[PDB]
Design an enzyme around this catalytic site. Sequence first.
Site, PDB file in Angstrom:
ATOM      1  N   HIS A  10      28.865  33.258 -11.671  1.00  0.00           N
ATOM      2  CA  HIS A  10      27.657  32.565 -12.073  1.00  0.00           C
ATOM      3  C   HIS A  10      27.616  31.120 -11.583  1.00  0.00           C
ATOM      4  CE1 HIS A  10      30.444  31.739 -15.518  1.00  0.00           C
ATOM      5  NE2 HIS A  10      29.880  30.545 -15.484  1.00  0.00           N
ATOM      6  N   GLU A  46      24.851  28.059 -24.466  1.00  0.00           N
ATOM      7  CA  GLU A  46      24.795  28.655 -23.141  1.00  0.00           C
ATOM      8  C   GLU A  46      23.913  29.885 -23.087  1.00  0.00           C
ATOM      9  OE1 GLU A  46      28.945  28.982 -21.343  1.00  0.00           O
ATOM     10  OE2 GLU A  46      29.379  27.943 -23.231  1.00  0.00           O
ATOM     11  N   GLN A  63      23.843  30.335 -15.252  1.00  0.00           N
ATOM     12  CA  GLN A  63      24.193  29.980 -16.616  1.00  0.00           C
ATOM     13  C   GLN A  63      23.594  28.633 -16.987  1.00  0.00           C
ATOM     14  OE1 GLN A  63      28.280  28.553 -17.670  1.00  0.00           O
ATOM     15  NE2 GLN A  63      28.197  30.227 -19.163  1.00  0.00           N
ATOM     16  N   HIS A  89      28.446  23.683 -11.924  1.00  0.00           N
ATOM     17  CA  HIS A  89      29.611  24.245 -11.252  1.00  0.00           C
ATOM     18  C   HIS A  89      29.450  25.715 -10.883  1.00  0.00           C
ATOM     19  CE1 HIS A  89      30.505  25.379 -15.469  1.00  0.00           C
ATOM     20  NE2 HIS A  89      31.178  26.383 -14.938  1.00  0.00           N
ATOM     21  N   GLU A 139      35.114  27.058 -11.491  1.00  0.00           N
ATOM     22  CA  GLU A 139      35.745  27.803 -12.576  1.00  0.00           C
ATOM     23  C   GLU A 139      36.224  29.176 -12.126  1.00  0.00           C
ATOM     24  OE1 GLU A 139      32.899  28.855 -15.639  1.00  0.00           O
ATOM     25  OE2 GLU A 139      34.371  29.920 -16.848  1.00  0.00           O
TER      26      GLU A 139
END
Lengths: 145, 147
Positions: A10, A46, A63, A89, A139
């Site tokens: 994502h 989120e 996201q 990110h 991530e």
Amino acid sequence: NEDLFICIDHVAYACPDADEASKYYQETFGWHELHREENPEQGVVEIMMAPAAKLTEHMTQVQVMAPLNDESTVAKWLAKHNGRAGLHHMAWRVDDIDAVSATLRERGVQLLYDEPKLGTGGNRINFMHPKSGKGVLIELTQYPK
Amino acid sequence: MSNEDLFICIDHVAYACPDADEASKYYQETFGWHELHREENPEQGVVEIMMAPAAKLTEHMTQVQVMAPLNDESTVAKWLAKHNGRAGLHHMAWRVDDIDAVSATLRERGVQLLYDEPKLGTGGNRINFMHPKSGKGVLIELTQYPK
């Protein structure tokens, strides 16, 4: 050699209001809201959005992240960026975060946590230093089990 | 006349770094991402590299597009400067089946596009962008594969 990544899981988008962004994504873009989560402790709300109602195996989602309090990580990021929404990110999906963390480590990769941490769903996650990402925060994320 | 999805998937995430070759070396060496195409355009002063997590792309697999200035007059060099010499996610591009139709629909809903007409992208894709105010803090690209 071998592939340590299945796909981009994502792309995290930080904004001051997750609800507003999700409704914009749905009303204007016709995207689909697949999941919504609120974590008081992290002070973050989120929402997971996708271009289709049903995800395909490698379908990358968006996201939406918004702060629940000015102490949250997201709030201070937004503050340091004109308080304007922006791409936060990239998260890449792994089949075995431990195994892949071993490989990454062996290749001189620097992570954020000594150990993977639980995130959305039963996901075991970890990150990379913003420098180890040449300016971008990346991530690592493994679906539960 | 039920509304249909306008987007197929996120075609690619653009990452603007000072050195494409460099960044590309990193993705392959460290991360083990496969390089699928490299292109250089003097007109615009940009070099682009398409990185994927696998050797072969799956229908909806998103790629990372490495951008880098070839000189200091390139739009990408400026951006890098604007983001204080810090490389970083530049934009998100969403794939569409028919850019003209998706563009018409988007405009009725109040979306603002950079170009009145689609521009020619890499590989022959037809592209356009949704004004930051439209993408909401983010610059979003519309991409149609040449067909």
